[PDB]
Amino acid sequence: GSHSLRYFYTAVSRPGLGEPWFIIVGYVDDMQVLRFSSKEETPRMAPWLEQEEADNWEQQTRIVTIQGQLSERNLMTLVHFYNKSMDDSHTLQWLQGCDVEPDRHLCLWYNQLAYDSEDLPTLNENPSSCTVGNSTVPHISQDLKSHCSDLLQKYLEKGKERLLRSDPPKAHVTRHPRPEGDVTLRCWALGFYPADITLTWQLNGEELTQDMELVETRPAGDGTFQKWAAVVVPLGKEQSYTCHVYHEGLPEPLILRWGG
């Protein structure tokens, strides 16, 4: 029942010539829902959202536009503070957002920064706490934190069809003779939704490791993700090995037996 909203921020300074470049991509779970960068008046939002009839996105557009504008000042003081060559181009990555589950009055807030890939201290308490006592959008808006929980709900209400989705993987194994004295078995899982998924190879009922190959799960580009796991096996020993696919949209962990 938990859901999360995140805003990934990135600012890159241009050695001397010009103003810094930046971008802010907003995600909800594993779906992108917002975008805003150097040169764009307002933020472009996922088409698949009910859009605007007068839709109040102000609070956001406001917070974001500000965060963006300030990128330069931010870049400078980090440089100053650490006196790094202004001849070089440094980047500033910043992560904010929250995890939420109303039926547990649970709101977790995140605020992580990093300069040139190095983390910047917090001593603020990693995930802090936010609130869900909605009703009125105050005058103390500057702060995104105070709105995270709300902004999330709006997105969920405006994307129910895509956000509250859950497409299980479609699996199948492919055999590829390894003219090297062995055979390779590849377990495919395609078009599944939440990217979190796990594949394993079991031999005679045992997890198989150190002899298997895994690829970072990748986006299909269509809104789902793909991933596959493979293993090398002695000729005709096919039916011996089995593949297991665990996933959120699966009623039960899917088990595969060589292409049939």
Partner: protein, 99 residues
């Protein structure tokens, strides 16, 4: 301070000649955001190519998805060309309809 990119080339849907699809080149785990990615059909920089909006993983490394709408054939060969500061020379990975 720097991280070389991981590349992956694949099709949106299972490769099947004569039928429309999408060629994908996926770059991740690389750092300095600046990166150059091109898709190649028989070796030529493909015309219309779009990519996702820049973003980064937990470890702060970035990742992008370059893609193009295409229709494969038993002959036409496709590949992806990635250029980054961490590279001595450009890197090219050939598409493979099985991997």
């Amino acid at each position: 301070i720097q991280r070389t990119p991981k590349i992956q080339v694949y099709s949106r849907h299972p490769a099947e000649n004569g039928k429309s699809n999408f060629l994908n080149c996926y770059v991740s785990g690389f750092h300095p955001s600046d990166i150059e990615v091109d898709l190649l059909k028989n070796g030529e920089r493909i015309e219309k190519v779009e990519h996702s909006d820049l973003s980064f993983s937990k470890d702060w490394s970035f990742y992008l998805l370059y893609y193009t709408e295409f229709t494969p054939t038993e002959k036409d060969e496709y590949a992806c060309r990635v250029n980054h500061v961490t590279l001595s020379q450009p890197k090219i990975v050939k598409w493979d309809r099985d991997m």
